[PDB]
């Protein structure tokens with residue numbers, strides 16, 4: 001994560017992030033609609049940050065410090081680079097949609113009027129096929145990754161000290177190897193809950209309610225396809 | 236501090252997400268209650284023992300029978316959640332969640348949690364349930380379900396008023412520590 005984004009999402013809601021004077025100029029329905037959108041981006045920022053810990057901190061750390069067998073690190077962190085690209089491109093689009101929405105002279109006062117189109121593009125066509133095949137592989141290799149981590153921690157002394165070392169910071173409290181793996185699996189199941197709560201306060205514009213209804217359907221279809229293509233693996 | 240894993244299970248609108256947010260923040264959110272709970276590690280001191288309690292939720296996984304069990308690996312205590320304003324959600328406790336939890340998590344203690352107890356005196360709740368020939372889940376009905384499913388215990392709470400919230404997580408920590 002980068003300081004700029006962390007500050008922009010340091011508040012516990014949209015109502016607390018924007019200047020009170022700007023907030024006071026909006027209908028209560030808009031404040032609710034923006035609060036849930038702010039959470040979709042806040043949790044997407046945290047999702048990408050989880051993936052950066054897995055790629056740079058854990059995965060890359062083991063390659064540059066440990067003498068592990070080739071392929072062990074791939075078993076520990078399956079499809080992390082592919083997942084990282086998929087979500088960093090989604091986060092890019094979400095963050096530019098907010099920056100465009102900012103009114104002149106401010107870096108925190110915004111109202112995102114259109115979101116449905118961005119969600120329709122992310123959860124349809126090639127991008128949806130790429131997440132489907134990625135998450136189907138990630139979730140099938142999830143158990144194998146957990147057992148593999150536990151074996152390496154209960155047998156290798158060097159791996160044990162590397163894990164104790166990197167996880168020592170206060171910021172990595174809820175972000176160990178196993179928490180990072182479950183955090184990513186649960187992520188895809190958050191979208192329908194978030195899109196459904198945004199949709200509930202998006203009736204002002206009829207083409208936006210339809211966009212979010214199409215996006216909600218597209219995500220549920222994706223989650224169904226991933227659920228059907230799951231085949232647990234074992235070491 | 237020993238590390239222990241807690242997982243909450245239950246029907247869609249049984250308050251499993253509110254219960255985790257309210258405990259991790261220590262208050263009912265005054266401005267915005269979040270839609271989702273990512274995870275949280277609680278530093279709990281119960282009966283003298285110092286435990287690091289990882290908190291997880293299964294919200295969003297209810298319709299995905301292959302994806303959901305990926306939440307279960309290494310669970311040390313299960314919070315089986317039902318809503319007191321929803322007697323139909325209590326019916327699915329032994330016929331849906333109990334067989335699944337006992338299959339993926341055998342010998343792991345389960346605590347039956349009656350959520351939204353404040354709604355026992357809410358007039359709108361008793362009126363809406365009457366147009367169904369129903370009423371809020373009674374304390375003895377909750378105990379009897381916890382009894383039949385071999386739950387380690389039965390507890391009631393209200394994420395809205397924070398009543399019973401601390402006691403559930405302190406008890407779940409005690410249950411997780413057991414041999």
Ligand SMILES: *CC(=O)N1C[C@@H](C(N)=O)Oc2ccccc21
Pocket residue numbers: 019021022025102103104105106109
């Ligand atoms: C763009 C901005 O930050 N504004 C613009 C102004 C408007 N709706 O034109 O409203 C307010 C109020 C307080 C602070 C900043 C702004």
